[PDB]
UniProtKB/Swiss-Prot annotation:
<keyword id="KW-0732">Signal</keyword>
<comment type="similarity">
    <text>Belongs to the peptidase A1 family.</text>
</comment>
<feature type="active site">
    <location>
        <position position="199"/>
    </location>
</feature>
<keyword id="KW-0645">Protease</keyword>
<feature type="domain" description="Peptidase A1">
    <location>
        <begin position="17"/>
        <end position="328"/>
    </location>
</feature>
<keyword id="KW-0378">Hydrolase</keyword>
<feature type="active site">
    <location>
        <position position="35"/>
    </location>
</feature>
<keyword id="KW-1015">Disulfide bond</keyword>
<feature type="disulfide bond">
    <location>
        <begin position="255"/>
        <end position="290"/>
    </location>
</feature>
<protein>
    <recommendedName>
        <fullName>Endothiapepsin</fullName>
        <ecNumber>3.4.23.22</ecNumber>
    </recommendedName>
</protein>
<keyword id="KW-0064">Aspartyl protease</keyword>
<keyword id="KW-0865">Zymogen</keyword>
<dbReference type="GO" id="GO:0004190">
    <property type="term" value="F:aspartic-type endopeptidase activity"/>
</dbReference>
<dbReference type="GO" id="GO:0006508">
    <property type="term" value="P:proteolysis"/>
</dbReference>
């Protein structure tokens, strides 16, 4: 089997991407944030504290003939941006782009933090990291991908995120029309439960490539590119007037600037992030200070190849017995 679904930016900045997901019988379609950095499929629901729902579409398990309470199971998750959610668990039929999993754990939110309430466009998350990170207790649950894997034509999914435009998540096949050149594959460590890999270095603009190992995670649920302070300083030093602002919470730059590209290494291959991808716009409405899309990972504890980086590539998440990651230009 295979699946193919379009993923759409939630706003003009590509702050996140939503993908329609069918849950239950008859189908209830919710728009979920596919997140390769976590492993819970959770939804706003009929059980979510009413004051914490503001415009989201909810899952109502009582209206699904295939929903079953997973008795005794609870979940609770905290994300890197400080947001969180928690609740109980149902199993139900879940379909993505024509690919159907029966008996998927669908984690129903009883509580969500303010960041989630305030984002009316995201109805929940669908985690695509390794199932060892799943938070369901006392019986850990599998991700949608892990459940689908054995049925897939090939044990892979691909992320093809657009810049200010829709893109695609495919399951079970590699669309050879969706990228240019060849795909370069690189080793993955699953020791922390992430799609963790080592970039071979970077360049700023038309500058020379610096060969240096940068360990980080491929994370579709993180907006920006978070790299070591040395790398980030080297990038922003090429933008006149750019500075790190503790009050704003990272590097800012004059909105009048033209940003240089940023290149990252995948083995002997190179992925180029155009400068425009690094512009996240005014820090507040009408400001001439703009927020940077490359930020320091210092004090996160991990480097993160978030959407800024991933949207510059066609990315293969290979879930074979020995997982790997593939990157191609497009």
């Amino acid at each position: 089997s295979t699946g193919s679904a379009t993923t759409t930016p939630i706003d003009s900045l590509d702050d996140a991407y939503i993908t329609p997901v069918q849950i239950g019988t008859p189908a209830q379609t919710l728009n979920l944030d596919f997140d390769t950095g976590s492993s819970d499929l959770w939804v706003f629901s009929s059980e979510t504290t009413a004051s914490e729902v503001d415009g989201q579409t909810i899952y109502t398990p009582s209206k699904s003939t295939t929903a079953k309470l997973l008795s005794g199971a609870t979940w609770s998750i905290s994300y890197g941006d400080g947001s969180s959610s928690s609740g109980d668990v149902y199993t139900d039929t879940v379909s993505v782009g024509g690919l159907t999993v029966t008996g998927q754990a669908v984690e129903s939110a009883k509580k969500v933090s303010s960041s989630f309430t305030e984002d009316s466009t995201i109805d929940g998350l669908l985690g695509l990291a390794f199932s060892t990170l799943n938070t369901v207790s006392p019986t850990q649950q599998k991700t949608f991908f892990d459940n689908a894997k054995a049925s897939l034509d090939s044990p892979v999914f691909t992320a093809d995120l657009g810049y200010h435009a829709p893109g695609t998540y495919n399951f079970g096949f590699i669309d050879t029309t969706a990228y240019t050149g060849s795909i370069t594959y690189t080793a993955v460590s699953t020791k922390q439960g992430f799609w963790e890999w080592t970039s071979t270095g970077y360049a700023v603009g038309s500058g020379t490539f610096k060969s240096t190992s940068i360990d980080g995670i491929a994370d579709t649920g993180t907006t920006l590119l978070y790299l070591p302070a040395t790398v980030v300083s080297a990038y922003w030093a090429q933008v006149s007037g750019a500075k790190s602002s503790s009050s704003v919470g990272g590097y800012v730059f004059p909105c009048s600037a033209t940003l240089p590209s940023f290149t990252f290494g995948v083995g002997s291959a190179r992925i180029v992030i155009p400068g425009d991808y690094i512009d996240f716009g005014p820090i507040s409405t009408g400001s001439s200070s703009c927020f940077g899309g490359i930020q320091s990972s210092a004090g996160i504890g991990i480097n993160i190849f978030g959407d800024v980086a991933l949207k510059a590539a066609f990315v293969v998440f290979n879930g074979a017995t020995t997982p790997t990651l593939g990157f191609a230009s497009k």
